[PDB]
Amino acid sequence: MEAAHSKSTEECLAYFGVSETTGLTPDQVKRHLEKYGHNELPAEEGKSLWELVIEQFEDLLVRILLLAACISFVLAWFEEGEETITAFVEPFVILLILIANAIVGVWQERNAENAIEALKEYEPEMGKVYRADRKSVQRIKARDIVPGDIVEVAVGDKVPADIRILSIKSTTLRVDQSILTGESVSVIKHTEPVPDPRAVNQDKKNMLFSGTNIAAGKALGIVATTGVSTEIGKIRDQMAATEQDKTPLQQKLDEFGEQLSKVISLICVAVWLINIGHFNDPVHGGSWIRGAIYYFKIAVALAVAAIPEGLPAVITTCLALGTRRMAKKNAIVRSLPSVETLGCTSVICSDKTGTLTTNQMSVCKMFIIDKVDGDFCSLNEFSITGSTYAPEGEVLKNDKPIRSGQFDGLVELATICALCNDSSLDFNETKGVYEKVGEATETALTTLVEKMNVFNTEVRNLSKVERANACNSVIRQLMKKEFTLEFSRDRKSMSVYCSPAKSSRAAVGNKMFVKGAPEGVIDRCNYVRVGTTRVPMTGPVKEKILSVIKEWGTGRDTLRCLALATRDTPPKREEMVLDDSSRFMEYETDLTFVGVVGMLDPPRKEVMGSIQLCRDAGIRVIMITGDNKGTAIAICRRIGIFGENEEVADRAYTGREFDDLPLAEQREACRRACCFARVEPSHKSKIVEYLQSYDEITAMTGDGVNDAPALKKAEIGIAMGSGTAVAKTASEMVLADDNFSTIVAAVEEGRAIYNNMKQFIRYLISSNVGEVVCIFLTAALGLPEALIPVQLLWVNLVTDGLPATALGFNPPDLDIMDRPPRSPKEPLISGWLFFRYMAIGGYVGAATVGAAAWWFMYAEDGPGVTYHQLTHFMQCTEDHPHFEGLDCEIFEAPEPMTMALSVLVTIEMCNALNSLSENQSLMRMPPWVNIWLLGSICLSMSLHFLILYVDPLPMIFKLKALDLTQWLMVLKISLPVIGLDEILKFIARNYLEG
Numbered sequence: 001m002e003a004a005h006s007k008s009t010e011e012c013l014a015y016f017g018v019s020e021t022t023g024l025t026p027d028q029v030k031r032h033l034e035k036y037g038h039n040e041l042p043a044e045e046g047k048s049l050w051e052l053v054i055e056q057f058e059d060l061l062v063r064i065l066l067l068a069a070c071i072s073f074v075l076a077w078f079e080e081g082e083e084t085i086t087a088f089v090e091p092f093v094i095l096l097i098l099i100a101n102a103i104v105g106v107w108q109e110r111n112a113e114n115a116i117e118a119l120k121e122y123e124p125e126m127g128k129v130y131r132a133d134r135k136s137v138q139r140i141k142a143r144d145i146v147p148g149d150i151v152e153v154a155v156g157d158k159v160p161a162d163i164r165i166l167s168i169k170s171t172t173l174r175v176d177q178s179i180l181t182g183e184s185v186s187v188i189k190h191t192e193p194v195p196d197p198r199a200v201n202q203d204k205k206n207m208l209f210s211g212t213n214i215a216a217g218k219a220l221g222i223v224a225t226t227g228v229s230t231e232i233g234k235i236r237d238q239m240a241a242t243e244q245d246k247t248p249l250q251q252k253l254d255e256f257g258e259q260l261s262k263v264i265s266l267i268c269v270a271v272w273l274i275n276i277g278h279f280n281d282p283v284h285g286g287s288w289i290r291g292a293i294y295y296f297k298i299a300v301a302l303a304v305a306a307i308p309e310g311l312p313a314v315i316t317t318c319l320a321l322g323t324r325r326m327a328k329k330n331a332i333v334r335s336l337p338s339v340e341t342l343g344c345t346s347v348i349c350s351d352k353t354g355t356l357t358t359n360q361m362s363v364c365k366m367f368i369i370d371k372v373d374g375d376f377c378s379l380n381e382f383s384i385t386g387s388t389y390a391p392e393g394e395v396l397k398n399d400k401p402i403r404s405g406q407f408d409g410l411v412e413l414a415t416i417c418a419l420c421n422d423s424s425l426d427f428n429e430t431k432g433v434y435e436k437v438g439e440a441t442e443t444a445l446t447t448l449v450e451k452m453n454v455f456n457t458e459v460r461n462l463s464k465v466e467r468a469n470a471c472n473s474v475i476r477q478l479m480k481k482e483f484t485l486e487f488s489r490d491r492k493s494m495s496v497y498c499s500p501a502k503s504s505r506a507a508v509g510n511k512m513f514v515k516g517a518p519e520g521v522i523d524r525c526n527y528v529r530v531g532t533t534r535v536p537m538t539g540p541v542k543e544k545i546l547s548v549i550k551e552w553g554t555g556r557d558t559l560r561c562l563a564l565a566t567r568d569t570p571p572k573r574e575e576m577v578l579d580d581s582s583r584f585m586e587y588e589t590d591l592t593f594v595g596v597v598g599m600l601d602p603p604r605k606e607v608m609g610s611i612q613l614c615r616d617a618g619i620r621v622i623m624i625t626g627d628n629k630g631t632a633i634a635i636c637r638r639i640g641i642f643g644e645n646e647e648v649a650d651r652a653y654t655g656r657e658f659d660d661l662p663l664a665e666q667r668e669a670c671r672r673a674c675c676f677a678r679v680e681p682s683h684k685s686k687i688v689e690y691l692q693s694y695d696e697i698t699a700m701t702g703d704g705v706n707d708a709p710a711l712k713k714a715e716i717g718i719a720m721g722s723g724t725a726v727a728k729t730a731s732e733m734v735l736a737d738d739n740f741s742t743i744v745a746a747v748e749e750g751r752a753i754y755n756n757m758k759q760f761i762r763y764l765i766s767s768n769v770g771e772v773v774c775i776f777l778t779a780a781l782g783l784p785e786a787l788i789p790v791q792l793l794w795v796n797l798v799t800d801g802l803p804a805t806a807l808g809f810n811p812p813d814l815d816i817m818d819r820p821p822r823s824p825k826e827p828l829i830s831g832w833l834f835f836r837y838m839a840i841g842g843y844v845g846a847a848t849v850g851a852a853a854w855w856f857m858y859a860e861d862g863p864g865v866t867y868h869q870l871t872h873f874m875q876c877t878e879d880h881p882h883f884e885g886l887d888c889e890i891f892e893a894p895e896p897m898t899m900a901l902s903v904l905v906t907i908e909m910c911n912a913l914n915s916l917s918e919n920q921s922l923m924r925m926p927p928w929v930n931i932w933l934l935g936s937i938c939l940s941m942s943l944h945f946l947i948l949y950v951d952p953l954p955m956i957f958k959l960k961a962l963d964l965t966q967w968l969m970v971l972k973i974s975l976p977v978i979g980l981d982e983i984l985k986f987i988a989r990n991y992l993e994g
């Protein structure tokens with residue numbers, strides 16, 4: 001295991017004492033394999049076994065409803081009254097709901113694809129090595145590859161480990177490093193040491209990274225690291241070391257879970273404490289085990305009254321219909337709970353290229369030297385029209401079309417852009433528009449050369465297929481490109497060594513053609529081209545050039561600029577060695593500046609507006625970009641991250657500037673920063689940590705395994721649809737169209753969805769408060785059992801379950817994106833809303849109890865004993881207050897219960913309407929604003945008749961409440977809940993909140 005791309009090929013061999021020709025000996029292999037382990041990432045042990053479910057049952061509010069399932073089964077055996085076989089469905093239904101909420105609850109197929117898993121895809125099964133025990137090329141399990149052993153790689157091979165290149169057997173080695181970046185265009189390798197101990201992967205020109213694959217050639221190298229110690233394995237570990245917090249809702253539901261369990265077993269002691277009657281009253285009779293069955297009866301009644309069963313199903317359905325909706329709008333949300341955290345997003349860090357912009361480069365402006373007289377110099381400047389890749393548009397001067405070949409320097413400008421170029425252009429016959437073949441910046445030039453028709457080639461008589469590369473071809477006819485010196489970040493340029501195709505125009509020797517970032521290229525220009533003449537570089541000249549470059553890059557029209565120059569008399573062909581990449585810069589020396597091109601990658605049509613939408617939503621937007629700081633700040637102005645003229649010093653940092661900052665100062669930079677330029681390997685991940693340190697819900701965009709730890713880390717990882725397999729799985733959302741506005745649009749959707757959830761979560765539990773407050777009263781201060789569990793199970797699944805789902809379809813609030821993001825710790829119910837629900841639960845608690853008790857005092861048709869005082873006695877062993885009459889069964893009658901259910905169903909219908917809004921009256925924000933709710937109100941009441949009339953069903957429940965006088969009291973006991981809430985709903989006029 002070496003730490004060196006920075007060492008000579010000798011040094012690495014000597015490190016492990018291997019011979020390049022023999023490789024590692026069988027003993028070395030053994031020694032090494034023990035020191036370093038196998039070439040593999042650890043196995044993941046959280047697999048698909050039933051552990052899923054036994055966990056699902058491990059929860060409190062599941063265990064509590066399971067203990068009450070066992071109690072229900074023991075009770076469904078010992079029976080009196082009519083000894084009917086139908087009451088066996090009672091302990092059977094809970095078990096079914098405990099299964100249905102488990103199966104659907106344990107839906108970790110959405111989480112079956114975890115990002116660390118996806119990382120095995122890039123370790124191959126096979127690798128080839130040159131051990132000492134065979135002179136041949138043993139092809140072994142990649143697993144058994146050790147650091148120090150001499151490896152072989154050829155075209156098509158996935159690189160088996162992090163390898164220090166030793167010898168390139170083919171004329172050139174190209175590797176595809178997309179898994180890292182996403183940046184398809186393959187890179188050239190070399191053998192020379194990269195002497196900076198802290199070189200980033202991009203710049204490790206002599207290394208092959210495990211999991212990467214070879215595009216062209218054959219090379220022999222020495223394995224340096226394996227297992228978790230390769231680049232890819234280091235990314236694995238960071239991902240393993242980050243743990244996900246639970247979504248702020250999931251957290252509340254657990255907190256509500258715990259606090260419910262507390263209230264449940266705080267009533268059980270109160271019931272016992274209120275029942276110091278049985279402990280002193282019933283002298284004898286064997287009621288010690290016959291009366292302890294009564295507490296077990298109210299137990300299962302207390303549980304189901306509190307547990308808001310089916311809420312799982314409601315929230316799950318609501319979210320599932322959220323995912324479908326978001327997809328139509330190009331936001332693919334991998335994980336269901338995400339649609340909530342999405343709603344809370346307070347910061348978006350977005351890559352510029354292809355997300356904030358279109359990634360469609362076109363050259364707009366270009367200049368060359370006009371005249372250089374002493375200390376004054378003028379330039380010739382030109383615009384170019386049309387932003388597409390079509391060779392369709394014009395060069396113009398002073399806003400008027402001109403002919404580029406009339407300018408000697410434009411000729412050479414075009415020569416360089418066509419020769420110093422690895423791309424080209426292709427007319428897609430099928431779609432009917434042209435196409436880049438390669439890097440976009442490079443194609444922008446090809447298109448340019450196509451528009452400047454310097455040699456005046458006839459084009460209007462040409463096929464739209466030939467047309468594509470017509471003029472470039474003419475320039476290739478003119479100069480034979482021998483070799484080419486690749487780009488490198490170290491010198492920020494690229495040249496091309498060219499010879500004259502023996503046409504004999506400018507037949508004065510070979511020529512290198514240099515194009516690169518303006519600073520470096522210009523610094524290596526001793527000369528300036530002026531038409532065809534050449535004059536020494538001077539301060540005034542260099543000032544003029546740089547002055548305009550600065551204008552174009554930082555001005556309103558934001559142009560990335562390339563300087564182009566040529567080496568008039570390049571070093572001898574033989575005297576150059578093309579293998580020495582650090583030697584490339586000195587070959588590009590004694591240049592003659594020729595011209596500059598300024599190209600644009602336009603801000604996507606919708607960003608300007610979307611960013612404004614974020615301003616209003618109180619969402620920070622942070623641009624991460626490869627632009628130089630100057631242009632970063634400019635582009636930011638252009639798209640409205642910064643005011644057209646505002647102060648921005650401390651607000652935008654280069655990656656280097658960030659690095660110079662002490663930790664604390666770095667942290668403080670992130671709570672303010674809106675633009676990061678030329679950010680490094682670590683940075684995204686650091687940016688996310690700091691943002692989180694200020695309690696910010698963070699959206700972060702990225703691609704590649706490079707960006708996976710950041711996407712894991714961020715509350716919202718965001719991959720591009722065109723992105724790698726791994727970035728995709730690491731993300732919490734995929735953007736199908738790569739557009740920025742899809743994030744912003746997905747945020748609005750999440751705020752919309754959550755708002756209704758708040759309402760339907762609150763409504764559904766609001767019912768349970770009532771049920772408990774009811775069941776308590778019908779146990780302690782009174783005995784006449786008002787509601788039985790079975791009824792409540794059907795109430796909490798269907799009668800409330802439909803309006804609950806309908807609230808899921810509530811009409812989106814009108815000002816969502818004009819209020820700031822929701823606090824994650826903001827509780828759904830406290831303050832005034834607690835007392836509000838504390839009263840509604842209480843009211844209904846006294847309504848269903850009151851309508852069960854009213855059955856005694858008033859009821860005309862059917863049993864009606866005025867002031868019967870069922871609170872007095874329930875056992876019926878005496879029958880002395882009742883002198884002579886067979887009556888002791890009206891106690892467990894299927895009629896006074898049908899009163900309560902009819903009330904409960906009806907109040908929840910009003911409380912469903914009540915729950916359309918939080919604050920606005922139903923006369924301000926009407927019940928007819930939600931057509932699906934009315935549709936549910938109808939269906940809810942309709943199915944209530946069904947289980948009351950069609951006989952099989954009113955057997956497990958009760959008997960029909962025929963009378964209209966009986967249904968009149970139902971409405972007269974239930975409908976005033978609208979009135980109570982309404983008073984409280986708008987007491988907020990006084991309570992100065994809204």
Ligand SMILES: C/C=C(/C)C(=O)O[C@H]1C(C)=C2[C@H]([C@@H]1OC(=O)CCCCCCC)[C@@](C)(OC(C)=O)C[C@H](OC(=O)CCC)[C@@]1(O)[C@H]2OC(=O)[C@@]1(C)O
Binds near residue numbers: 252259828833834
């Ligand atoms: C299911 C029915 C009930 C009555 C249950 O106790 O819910 C309580 C409870 C656990 C909470 C309360 C209920 O508190 C009470 O009702 C007081 C007890 C009075 C009962 C009468 C005595 C016999 C919720 C339901 O209702 C009221 C009346 O305000 C609101 C909210 O719950 C939520 O917001 C859930 C969101 C995930 C929680 O106070 C919550 O505990 C929390 O941690 C919270 C903050 O969440």
Ligand SMILES: CC(=O)C1=C(O)N2[C@@H](C1=O)[C@@H]1c3c[nH]c4cccc(c34)C[C@@H]1C2(C)C
Binds near residue numbers: 056059099102253
């Ligand atoms: C409010 C609240 O926290 C909860 C809920 O409201 N539900 C779920 C739950 O925990 C429980 C649910 C999740 N997973 C399973 C598996 C099996 C059975 C259940 C569940 C029922 C639980 C219920 C209904 C209490």
